[PDB]
Amino acid sequence: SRPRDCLDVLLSGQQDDGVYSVFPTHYPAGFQVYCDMRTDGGGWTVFQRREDGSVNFFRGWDAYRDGFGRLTGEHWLGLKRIHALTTQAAYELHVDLEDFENGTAYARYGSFGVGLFSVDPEEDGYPLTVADYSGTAGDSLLKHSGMRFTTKDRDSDHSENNCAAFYRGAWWYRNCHTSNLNGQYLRGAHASYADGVEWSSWTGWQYSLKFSEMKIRPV
Amino acid sequence: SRPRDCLDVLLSGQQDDGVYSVFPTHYPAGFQVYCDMRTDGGGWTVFQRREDGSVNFFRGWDAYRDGFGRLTGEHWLGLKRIHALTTQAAYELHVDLEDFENGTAYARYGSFGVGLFSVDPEEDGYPLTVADYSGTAGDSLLKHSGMRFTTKDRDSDHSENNCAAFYRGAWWYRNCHTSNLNGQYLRGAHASYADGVEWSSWTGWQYSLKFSEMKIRPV
Amino acid sequence: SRPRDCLDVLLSGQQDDGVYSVFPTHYPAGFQVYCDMRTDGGGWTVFQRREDGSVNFFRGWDAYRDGFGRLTGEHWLGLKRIHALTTQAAYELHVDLEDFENGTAYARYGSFGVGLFSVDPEEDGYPLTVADYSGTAGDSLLKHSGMRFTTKDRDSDHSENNCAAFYRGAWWYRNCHTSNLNGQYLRGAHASYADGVEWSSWTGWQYSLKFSEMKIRPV
Amino acid sequence: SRPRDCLDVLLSGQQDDGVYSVFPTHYPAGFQVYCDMRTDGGGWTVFQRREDGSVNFFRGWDAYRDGFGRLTGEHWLGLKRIHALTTQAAYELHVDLEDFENGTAYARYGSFGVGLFSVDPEEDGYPLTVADYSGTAGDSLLKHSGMRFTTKDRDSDHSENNCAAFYRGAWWYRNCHTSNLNGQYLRGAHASYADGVEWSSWTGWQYSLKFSEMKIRPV
């Protein structure tokens, strides 16, 4: 009837990967998401996908709040939706990564949230909660814990510059990053420093990954 | 109680053409629509009507998003409502056309949607999904499949010009159109090229139709 | 539980005049109104009251859309709320009037609505539907039937001037009015022409009434 | 299921202080609040907390309407939420205060509301209803009864100046205050006049308190 996320969709008997309606506690109008019904038993709600560089990710605050791209392709679900999902239960984060040489890796985080205790999550800059790493990609997100989301037109980072402008992305930048999954789709090894789709613990600071998917499931 | 569209209204025992409240999955406040309870068994939700040139259709983005005119007359329901309806099930499209010489024709499309997988349908320009033509008017819409909606103040077409400005309408313009049902009410044969209420496969590019109705029903 | 108007409040067993929560079909968040539980059996939802000139009624479009003043005093409920109420059933209108010499009169209208078939009632200027006069005040509203709402900053009237600016009010002005109940609180006989709280059929065009209340009930 | 406030949360069997979802009558999307389940039996909804000066309270109208800070720390819930809560039942107010010398005091008000009868509470400046003082801190709020909320960018006070600008806060200022709990975190005795976290009846006009919490419970 009114699944709150992709795990409710799965447990209701929908086993196919694809687009489903979900209805978070404080977003009763609901919205559509892509559900991953396969990874570690399934029930993952996707909020980010890179796969081909068809979508511009070098977007401003309003786009990162409201979301962009298409659920069946490259997209960002929007921080207002990611907030609505991660405040309604205790979520884990799964990050799937792929390079241009057939290689894959993943990072699992036991706890993940955006603006968890923010009275106005947008005003407060949708700050990251993330803890408890495991997997094959190595940890490139724990150092971003407690940071606000920074875009090219809204600087909340710990740099004298705008990290989002400098590294051509949008992220919970500190000074500046170990991960940049909303970075430019530069397609593998690049001369420019850390401004591609980067997961530094796996492929370093000068390798733009082929594929990324960020997704959440209640624990 | 809470019909999601005009087919739910019909199946609940309301047989009369007219204005009814509907409540789409992701638009729970609901809104009023005109229901066609006669065409091919009935249960059609109208989203566009031309009949007399009493309403200005040469409107900008905000008007095409939010809707304009009156449900009992010439109107555009608004792309935010057309999105809310066509994302909640698989809809077919019916187009009824009438010329100034008593003549009528129709086009049926087995699949129709607006912004079906768009995270932000407005940002993404409410792109058209349409397939599977049958009827008497001929096909003037399949070539618009995959195109974003373009208005005089928001150009997303495949022309070096603004198709909406050039052809005095608002449509899923490519370069530029085979149909222009939101074009100027020029009343039959006109010297100006393709800037009237055009359905090119029936009446060509220099004939502004007397009547158009665009309406949807779940399959 | 969820009364749609003051008649539902009354029929649920609440007999006292006062402020109650109501929940119109297409305004599910609901809002508070003043309920008149006495007039002709009771169940009237108030949307306008003048009684002492304590509130400024010479307000612009946004104020007339959103409402102003206090439910326990002088107020305007707001055209977005009056639209939400009058589109959900067939309403009658009751107008209670009082002069500064103890005198009272009323006008009853068998049908009343605002933006009844408007796709975007705000865009369409919340046009008046009113018919079927009876009472003691005489008819000062039927000539306003079919007119859009005009304010000092949004002219939709049939005058070469702005009727709202000229007659220091906000109304369904034609060219210009037989009633001006949102006019200046000028307190009885005044030299200035038709710019007070006027009901021309009762007290003419140069008498600003002491009290007005406009209220609706389903028939 | 859908508790309307922290008293519903408590009565449903949740006994722990912390963050909970509540769903006021006219705010059906709901929001998260901090619940005090200990004070005088518990069931208090917090809307203001000062404790360490980590959050800037010298904010404009939009911030005071929408809220700021974090539920687990210093915050302001937002006047739109405080209005949604206090209009749905008859609430009492509890104010807990603490100085920098281990000392504590409280004020209880038998009746408390914001914009209780306002058609547009924001337009009307979220005016204060407060009565019926008891406790140890003395009364520093009854003189603010009937006053609109004033910020540095929106003056509705009875001063020829902007009280909010002058006393570096945001409050139901008259000319100007006996309390200033949204004032600057100046940390105890200060030379500047009345521009700290002031409760004049307890610690006078030149002592910025260490801790304040403002919270409500239905009577």
Ligand SMILES: *[C@@H]1O[C@H](CO)[C@@H](O[C@@H]2O[C@H](CO)[C@@H](O[C@@H]3O[C@H](CO)[C@@H](O)[C@H](O)[C@@H]3O)[C@H](O)[C@H]2NC(C)=O)[C@H](O)[C@H]1NC(C)=O
């Ligand atoms: C390396 O990456 C691929 C995915 O890109 C992993 O799975 C293999 O994918 C390929 C091509 O996507 C499949 O082979 C081809 O299948 C298609 C039909 O789907 C067929 O038309 C071609 O003729 C070709 O046979 C393949 O089925 C699939 N699995 C295997 C075992 O090759 C692959 O597992 C990744 N890792 C490694 C170590 O290869």
Ligand SMILES: *[C@@H]1O[C@H](CO)[C@@H](O[C@@H]2O[C@H](CO)[C@@H](O[C@@H]3O[C@H](CO)[C@@H](O)[C@H](O)[C@@H]3O)[C@H](O)[C@H]2NC(C)=O)[C@H](O)[C@H]1NC(C)=O
């Ligand atoms: C041609 O168009 C008309 C609709 O415009 C189709 O139906 C016919 O419509 C006319 C006028 O709208 C009707 O005739 C008139 O009826 C009115 C009362 O409704 C009466 O006052 C007049 O004296 C006149 O008789 C007519 O009933 C209606 N049907 C027919 C059979 O004429 C018509 O079917 C369309 N197609 C063709 C091939 O005529």
Ligand SMILES: *[C@@H]1O[C@H](CO)[C@@H](O[C@@H]2O[C@H](CO)[C@@H](O[C@@H]3O[C@H](CO)[C@@H](O)[C@H](O)[C@@H]3O)[C@H](O)[C@H]2NC(C)=O)[C@H](O)[C@H]1NC(C)=O
């Ligand atoms: C004329 O207007 C009044 C309302 O303004 C109508 O009712 C009468 O109202 C007056 C004063 O509002 C009442 O008289 C007074 O009552 C108060 C207590 O409420 C008392 O303190 C005073 O000493 C005084 O007696 C009165 O009860 C009320 N009814 C009558 C019969 O006078 C009145 O009906 C209107 N019409 C006419 C033709 O008088």
Ligand SMILES: *[C@@H]1O[C@H](CO)[C@@H](O[C@@H]2O[C@H](CO)[C@@H](O[C@@H]3O[C@H](CO)[C@@H](O)[C@H](O)[C@@H]3O)[C@H](O)[C@H]2NC(C)=O)[C@H](O)[C@H]1NC(C)=O
């Ligand atoms: C004065 O203020 C304190 C709260 O700040 C009131 O309670 C007392 O708080 C202190 C420190 O917060 C507690 O003492 C310490 O406890 C911690 C562990 O929580 C321990 O690590 C330290 O070694 C130390 O013992 C204390 O338990 C607590 N209660 C008492 C009876 O001291 C206090 O009631 C306030 N009023 C007065 C008159 O002292």
Ligand SMILES: [Ca+2]
């Ligand atoms: Ca910076």
Ligand SMILES: [Ca+2]
């Ligand atoms: Ca173009």
Ligand SMILES: [Ca+2]
């Ligand atoms: Ca005019």
Ligand SMILES: [Ca+2]
């Ligand atoms: Ca002032």
